[PDB]
Design a protein around this ligand. Structure first.
Ligand SMILES: [Mg+2]
Ligand SMILES: [Mg+2]
Ligand SMILES: [Mg+2]
Ligand SMILES: [Sr+2]
Length: 140
RNA sequence: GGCAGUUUGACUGGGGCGGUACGCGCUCGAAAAGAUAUCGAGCGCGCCCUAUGGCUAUCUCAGCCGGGGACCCGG
């Protein structure tokens, strides 16, 4: 039964939402791969009189690049619980977001015959804390 | 304008003044095919755009919720 049910880390997105940068240089060092900039939709009084323009950057880490990061990133954070999404997700922090999910996820990310993951296969807050906690650190 | 010839439109609950229903577009009036009037009700057009056109690739939007009214992740 299990195995095809045990949690997995599908992507860790690290980003800095400045609102202006060379911050890409450091985000790339702490992660290992090339960052990408983020534009800002809608204009605002806080001098964002530009819609399509650099406001921040991010990096999406998957597989080893993600673990090699969390091993040296999680120690930096502290909190837990009441900091976890309903989808068994959690973000702390420069921000660090961890996306967790069960094995049959591709079914909702592929092009052909897509389908939205059943709420029964959907990860849970508790199932999340467990997995993480059960991997080099403590909860709440 | 000393003098000559003329013009100075139409619509309109008479005419004048006001206005334009004088060329166009939409809803309603309009009575479940089409057509349909009033100085009928609501309101527009006389442009603007070299991309705000065209095709292809990739992608999904308003709004709300949860996690770190800018940005990031998920629903
Ligand atoms: Mg005369
Ligand atoms: Mg004569
Ligand atoms: Mg008719
Ligand atoms: Sr006369």
């Amino acid at each position: 039964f299990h195995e095809m049910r045990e949690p997995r880390i599908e992507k860790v997105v690290v980003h800095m939402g400045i609102g202006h940068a060379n911050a890409e240089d450091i985000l790339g060092e702490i992660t290992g791969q090339m960052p990408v900039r983020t534009k800002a939709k809608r204009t605002v009084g806080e001098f964002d009189i530009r819609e399509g323009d650099p406001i921040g950057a991010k990096v999406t880490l998957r597989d080893e690049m993600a673990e090699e990061f969390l091993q040296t990133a999680l120690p930096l954070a502290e909190l837990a619980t009441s900091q976890f999404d309903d989808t068994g997700n959690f973000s702390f922090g420069l921000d660090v977001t961890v996306n967790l999910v069960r094995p049959g996820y591709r079914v909702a990310k592929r092009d052909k015959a897509s389908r939205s993951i059943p709420t029964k296969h959907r990860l849970n807050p508790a199932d999340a804390v467990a997995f993480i906690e059960s991997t080099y650190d403590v909860e709440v």
